[model samples]
Target: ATSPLKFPGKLAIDTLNNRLFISDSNHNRIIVTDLEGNFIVQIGSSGEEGFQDGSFEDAAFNRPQGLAYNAKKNLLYVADTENHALREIDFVNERVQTLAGNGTKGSDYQGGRKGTKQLLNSPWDVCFEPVNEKVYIAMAGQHQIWEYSVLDGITRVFSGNGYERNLNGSTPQTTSFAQPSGISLGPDLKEAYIADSESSSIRALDLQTGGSRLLAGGDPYFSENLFKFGDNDGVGAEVLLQHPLGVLCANDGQIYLTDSYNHKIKKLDPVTKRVVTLAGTGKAGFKDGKVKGAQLSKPAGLAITENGRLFVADTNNSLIRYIDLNKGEDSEILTLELKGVQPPTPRASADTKIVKVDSVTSREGDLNLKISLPDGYHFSKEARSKFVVDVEPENAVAIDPTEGTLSPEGSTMLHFIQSSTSASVGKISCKVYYCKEDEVCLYQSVQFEVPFKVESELSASPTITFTVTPRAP
Candidate 1:
């Protein structure tokens, strides 16, 4: 029921409320859904890219990649990567604000500066530390890890010394990382894991001492970041990974990672440092079969519920692939459906028109609808148009189908058998993504109202109409 997703980069889950948060990376918005994939809300403009902080309806994000939900404060932290800022959605207050960064990319952090006064580089992922009241960010652009104080809003480098290389060090400052893009804490918060992306490795950082050691990938003595990439499984440094971008420390005391470039999901035993493929066939594609037969395309993020439902952000395929752990490796991968979520309403600059019909009657429990387009324009089958219906009172009238894509001809129907009032009020809305002779895509929004009186004996279905004429509003 929702518009198609494009280049989804990461995912987060709210175990308390059974909610899933997604970073719609290329589309520049955050989408919320129930655990089973029903649409809840969208946090930014769909298909629009920018750096602005405001209400959920007006705020904007640029290539967002990571999400961390803080249950204590009921905030959803975001790695607004391209904007070079960290943003947070205030669910309680119903607004969005910049938690850190000045909307510019700077190579070095200026010590422990006020979060809003400092500049940050491509922060690819974030994780909340409830114990310390801080959020750790994978500063991918600067090849380091940084911490943002949720208590005081101060941001400073947590690891690495602003260098891009693979080095296992005794302290956070001595470690050198090459584009660490994903991060997660251990089951009991004793250690942290980093998806050292460019180095094709996973590094474990001791939380108590702030020291990190190489867990897998990247040859021990050969420290350069770029020369190591392949698809093989072994223990410790012998394991071969291809630009891995996601890491997860499951409650079962196992570590899971996405060998993105290799198109495989692997599980690692921290005790033995042994890595093995858990799912995926090592091929880039879109398929939902058995675990070993499934395929993924550059998956960037993954999350697991306490009950064992695993969700993967299948980036290139633009799908949230999921499976149940209880079903074991034999379970089938399935795509999440965002039921009842539509593409965002177009920009305020778009032409909007409202029409009011006096009364309406239906024929055979159906109401006909139609659309009018510009002389040289036609509905875009590629992006598809959207339609929605809303009733004023809960039982004013019952619509068979409420929201979804419109037909190619911009014509559709709604069905109702009775009206609770002499005349019930309802709004019919639509958003059309279309193009003219030049074939350049553009979109517009329109809405109309109707007070209907049910008359089942009518011979014709009352036709509801709206338009997107170039010059009309």
Candidate 2:
């Protein structure tokens, strides 16, 4: 069956309207549709300005990816990736306002560097800690998870950085948090789950002291992959992750993960730590299931409906598919349309197309560009339409678009696209300006490079060596 949304990007279901809001990535806007796939209204555009006074005009969205509707606040939060900011679309008045800060004009306070009220670098996944009414931002570029208090009396701060590393006790304490992505609040609300991408583990952190405990860890079953807990043994959970991108918890307390590189959907009992396979047939790539049910390919964004059904943003397959928890392992519930020959379940396509930016890298004394992709799948030029690459280390010069050539191969080509640049150092970094396949824009980290210099000219023929240590997403 053909699903209503073709190439659905970022998506969120409104429990009240029983409808879904999706960031139709390629189309460069957001679409509001029903569970049955009926269109309601659309928001934003592909330009630079964002939603204004309920109508979109000069507002441009580089990549309108992640979209979240705060039913309580009745505001729609959009992760405007390339712009390096979060914009709020007033659902009631249809007005748009910058929520966090903007990343376009300058990376200054744009939220992807460090210790800024705004996002540090590239922002990715977001979750609302309803108990505190605070917003938790997965600051991908900064390699840290930040909490922002929206209500009065509540304050925001860096929750925790790194696995098991404590960021306290020092005069000005700080710990390196790996590429931390997707976040979800447990039923207890106080217990927060973070998908530490680079560390290959799902961890738990205490919001009060910015402290964290290893919920699951280690790749060799005994290493530090955070996914190991209780009897789960990390089978259905696997040890750590090849690249676990997204994480979400259901009302019933089941934690779900879009195990991107593994090409699987895993479920864990946050309390019991028992792991189970909810979807995906295994291995990688896309495949359709038969009597056993539907399969997935790089399933990224996951949402559990109020009724317990599972929704997946299957990236590689370019579709939104779901499984009915009520049916258990027996019933096949088709959510949208499906492609490929196996006749998979129904899903929606994100009609928009992407312009690819092949491999991004950095070298000693050379410009460095770091491109971060949204959770659920790897970077595919097919999902992005436009790009504004930002080069950094502050002093580096960006090759003019007309003068610089973008080719599939060659060392002379630009490393990656970025939105802004800084000369704080002599190195460079590039980040892709993109929105989530859905409507929300995540703040990914600012990919930066540092140049090594001679410690002292008088010291034994001073020599300099530049080694790039890429931060976690």
Candidate 3:
């Protein structure tokens, strides 16, 4: 069972340890969990936003947003947005402290030795640069990216000249940003991605060249329709976004962005030079199913796991939703379940494979399974697909709606009922029949075997317990 969440603003993950850290903005604290969504610990106190740093329980964060983990230091940096300060958490000592800023809202362009004495205005996001051993802040209020060095204990203006405009140039200081809200280092580490929110665009900053360039969106504003936006997939400026807030570079060499105002998650394919909607409906709500049908309410943050799961801070919805990238757009929006229980495993194959089981939960004799498909493959449009679920140990469980259409996004969900009253450990097998685009249906189907422990009692701890041990290909 997933814990109740409230207005999560940003998310960061420690890939090595499978830990997910989220800045629960409205709650005014940071929540820590494992990949399975089990609670580990929380930093800062809920309902108390202030400027105190001491024990983890007593520490306070004023509407904290962006979060980034420094693997080298084993520290988590936070953009205390409303507090106008940068904060850090030392994992080794379990201490929270203000790293920079004086709790004032203003910009410091002097760039000398002033570090903690400096002021920050609405710092929205933070990112670590391993090469320089510095953290970059998306100074949203100041309309610039600021740099802070832990080694030197100094802060300086990294990019922009405290101007609010969309201007890219060879000189970093001369360049400008329109309320940049998100920052992420690319795979090469030579460049970083910025979600220039107010500008309705994505920008790339070259660390070596110290220059900035518009990656997407910078169109002429039309006052008549301030919210005027459309879905157009094309290269660079040809693509349009409405007040995007978060950005992340994926292992696939592409970028994922939270198109906040548009209420959608978009993907930027550098090789194709186009922007495509990865998930979300244009409307705002908490519906979770297929990607095209799913809705997100002002999603503010995005993070991708090494295994290709995409996590979104559904800000207005007050919850976190995740998608299996290996499953493509067909993945389901899953809430974090309790700790120690693993989701179902997707069978691995060469062509047209099942990547992973996105989610599995059993309640009141009902079993639900969400399975994912490989990227770029979906059910054949010409023929109706079939989904089958078989429960082992005859009469243990009965599958309902055992057949359904395989969504074009490449995944499907099936439900089952416990036929017997007594508790029992059983195996559930699923099979999907489908074909890829441009390929004729040879009646190919992918099968997966999942083990489940089902309890008959309604008040039992958990209806099902499943574990997935990753295996080599």
Candidate 4:
């Protein structure tokens, strides 16, 4: 009664709520299961991908990755990785909202902006720091750590200067991270741990001071820390890890990590700064056996349950692996499964009235657009709704030959429209397909005439908000 899971990305354990959150990555959804691996619910369409936001099952995600449970807010903070976005899942309200990144990849150096209005690079992992009610993000694409403040609705770079390399320093702005992909709150309130994947090292990040140090892996003497990778295990910097992607702060006063490329699970003692292999034979395969004889194939995520039960997202193999830490080397590995679950079907068809929009913004203003459908209509699930835009007096406007598409966030479609320079006129020509849920999907080809003007008397990147509703009956 269950469908196959493809390339699941991350595992999040919520002991307080007794639930497990799995980012069904490639499938583009979040799967919720009980602590025992029984399906509880599924969010988003596993069969199709979009940028919609609605109820739990009605929303959409694009290659969602890291999931962190915020006990204070009782919500799941997601690194909607491929979308280059941060998302918040409020189960109680049964709604999903964008916290940052506007469904596009970006390279913005300015920090501390509105969470919903700005852009983010590829965020691979996120963790909560309740002390400041802020969420920390692992910006793998930017090679930096960012913090999003809950109270102020602002985000900014917390560490790293947007460089990609294995360099440590005493200040956040001066140090660098090479595609840091995983993060976990440290034992102390103002500290955190990082799985600096590209550098093959697990490093410590000081939340308040921005100071960082290499805890394990990555040869300190070697300048090319990125190339230092192996199966060797010992104390601190002497340890070698191959592109680790997961790190966990376990309840038993220890840190566990997945040496992804090397296919092994290792343990790190923060106090002694010692690193040792805990499981896996350092080989890539699947067989449930003793720790030294066990095998894992490119595991990517880690989570701990009650009584030292650690779970691994054995990603490359498309499976979940279980290890019992209480029994240690005596415990045999086991495969975990989600039962009675099925992949989500494509959303139902409905007439989302649409097609063609006119956006007029000054050289001092940004264009905001929205396309909506009639009362009972919605966009077709099977058809691609696309648009083409052009600006007259092109020399005075800044934009490419704009070919746009209608990707829904419900019955409406939204995209970022950029405008600059002096006065200009623009028109949007789009073909949208819509249906009445059960039958007769229809298409509409429409065009718009726009008159652009420059208002030098306006504000800072002033914004224009407008919607385009179809005239179909």
Candidate 5:
């Protein structure tokens, strides 16, 4: 078994591939390691901004915090908070690039101001659209959420209550956010969940517009018949939240929160206000071993895997811990053992590769994807790539080559060619293929859409353009 972490500073964790990805805040770099806590690969460093030499000096990152991975693209998005930028890590090349930022630091969202509009004032957290790669950055400084196009299109303010960066300062409107810290997108991908720390509440909003409604918050003890400041004896409103730090949604659609100041993890059953403590360190400390119902000293980040394993970046403890959701409270928990170099085993062997055999681009009709086998791989004429394509208005098809037989090559095409009339802005998604005869099988998918937009709401708001029809062949 690996040793639990002694992480230098407070960190954030994203659990994928049975491994934990952490943003080592104080160390000024990203750390990757296995479930046993063996160090794998590390990137970025404490600095300003510069080229990738494994050195973070002059690297436009300040107090790095939140992180999210897009497995489809093998890309990692990091919230360079104090630097006011979103940094993209290209796993294929091991380099860092700025996605959106004002070039210079400081939070300011003045539309049409060139570089100024790209800036974020103290971005706290960030999450990506499950289907598309569009990124949403929670700017604590600007008091707004900005949405940018994934295909290198224009960026716009998705929602906000004007521009004020202070916490808990009362605002006169509904859409305004007060020190929005941690944010998560629901499994449905249509709703955005935010932890409004200053407001002492968690809020929800429609992703399409900026409209929002309070989910649960505002003095967690308002109705509990008891009130106290910073007391967590499981008594009154203190049971709600003192300063919620992280939010995560499991594959089962349940929402989990890391109530840092409150010293526990709480589950919110959306249908009912019922809240339960999932795990804790009792009062926040760095003790190791089985942590069921144990006390925590400021746990900051939370992530749940498809298998229902929960990982917490126990900040003060300087380690990452986990709990198997299938087991009871007393079940043994696991932590990453950060001893030495541990080569990561690829989940799938690369001996078999998927290939695309047909066209996937479409315009305005039903599209179909064809699958086949690579030259040396085994496949049959009837070996269909059992994949699904998410049809958008303009490009109605996408395909995953590895969705079926051994080394199957997959290809998809639009039923109709995209034309100006049918072209519009949006996105398409699909699934990976599966094959039974071979020991090796892989999954793949694609996102494509034409750029087009129409102004149905406020005229002052320019028409949003997206790829409506497949680009002319």
Candidate 6:
């Protein structure tokens, strides 16, 4: 499997090929993987930031944040945030090039011009508007929404004034925005949603009326606090959010949000105007389990496939996670598996060996099995290692202390007894869980078999030896 990732920013999926694309922002590159999360390739060099167009090996970016795939055009668009430019990756031609911005940070509202001649101040996110055949950009540093046309090679202010404040207005030019970081067109194609980060709110922009309104967030009317942050879910203006960074509109008319600071994915019901947590435990950590029980660390991006799978850019954890919504109550978010290289296997040290096994007949009662390891490898002293032993034919045998820490002497001992009523062969399986001083723990198992003759009243006993290997750091 591949190694761990650096900070990731946004995610996009190629539904046609089932490939996932991630902006590994801090590493300054793009990551491509299958739907199962296996690494396919890295599009740019790690830690290298520049404006260049060549093969995937020569392409470069600076803190790429937003990603949008134009299925109709067979292209991928990137908001190269730090470089203050929009970039395009042609999947068909396998090439990358500048789509907008002049490589400098400044706001320009003029229309009827090519993108290369414009200056964009921190274009944080991009979303394709199919009806208009244009890409909408969340120009975060300038607090405005901009539109870029691929056919005309032109970009213009689509909404928001120059001011950085939260204000609902009747016209696009009169509306104001506060650090809009994520943008996505609604399923109906008549409106767009924005994750207004600085205001801790979600905003809706009308495509037909050219207006804006607050969907859900802190009450802006409160003089004491302009942006109140909390985890509470309620109606529209009463609802609260904590620095959300990504928003998505599903076909069901429900909106999903990546509540960045709260570390949760929230669902908003437009009909009821109620918001609820869909996943995450409101804590920051790397965990894979049930939606309510799992934790996330500043997840900043979200994407949903036509198959109802929700892909998450588990940013701070440097991993991609997803939920299979079709499973309903049984659905749990899981991390994608690493692709590429296999991890090293563990091996036993010369000082570790099986110490003894006390044989016992059917009539004599108990059997004893013991093994020892080097002092430094013992679980009791290391506190980071663990192991387990299980016996087959559970009804034919009874064992005491099936699993746990090793003894103080760097050894593990277990007592097994044969059941008088059962006439069957018995087998024992041993599994060791260990980690090197600098690496994470991994697993290995071994097994042994023994036979019994009920008519002759004879019992066969065998001593089994196994090796333990620590994973490489």
Look at candidate 1 and tell me the lDDT of residue 398: 79
Could you arrange the candidates by TM-score from highest to lowest? 1, 4, 6, 3, 5, 2
Ranking by lDDT: 1, 4, 6, 3, 5, 2
- Candidate models: Cα lDDT each: 0.81, 0.51, 0.72, 0.76, 0.55, 0.73
Give one digit per residue, the lDDT tens place, for model 3 in 32-71.
7766676656787545768788777778888999998876
Better TM-score candidate (2, 3): 3
Question: Which pairs, if any, clash in model 3?
Answer: 330-409
Q: Which segments of candidate 2 are over 4 A away from where they belong?
A: 1-10, 46-54, 104-119, 152-156, 161-176, 221-238, 283-287, 290-294, 331-473
Error of 2 at 293 (Å): 6.5
Model 3, residue 59: C-alpha shift (Å)? 0.7
Q: Name the best candidate (by TM-score).
A: 1
User: How much does candidate 2 score in TM-score?
Assistant: 0.60
Best by lDDT: 1
TM-score, every prediction: 0.73, 0.60, 0.69, 0.71, 0.64, 0.69
Q: lDDT tens string, model 5, 1-473? A: 23233333223344433345777665556676655565656665333332233223334345677887765455677877766767777553346777666535553454323323466676777787846768777767767767756676445677776544222222323467766778889888887787766665666767765677665655534646443224243322334566677777776767787777766777765545455677765566554545554666677787666667787876766667677877766655555556563221211111122232223223334334444433434333332333322334524223233132222444554333333433344333333333234422223333333333322222221121111111111
Residue 21 lDDT in model 5? 70
- Model 5 spans with C-alpha error above 4 angstroms: 1-19, 45-60, 103-107, 110-117, 162-173, 220-239, 288-293, 331-334, 341-473
Q: Model 2, 1-473: lDDT tens per residue?
A: 34433334456666644556666554556666556555545665432233333455434455655666675445677666556566677654446766665454333321233222444356666777655577777666566676555654222346543233322222113444566667777877776777776666676766665666545543454545444322223532344555566788788777888766666777777666665656655655455554134466666677667876667777666667777777665746354642221211211122212222322222222232333333552332322312233333432433343123212221122322222322222222222223335433222222223322323223121122222222222
Model 4 bad stretches (over 4 Å): 1-3, 220-227, 347-473
Taking the tens digit of each residue's C-alpha lDDT, what string does model 6 give over 1-473? Answer: 24356778899877644568888888777777767766655666535777777777678888999999875555779999988999998653457888888678875654446868887889999998755679999999988888898779888888888798888798878888989999888888988999988888888888876678888885656423655667767788778889999998888888889999999988887667789887899989878898889988899998888879999988888878888877978879988765641221112211122332333346223343444443355432323233455444555656576665444443454555666654544444444444335322233333434443233255443444444544322
Where does candidate 4 have its weakest 10-residue lDDT segment? Answer: 347-356
Give the worst 10-residue stretch by lDDT in candidate 1. Answer: 344-353
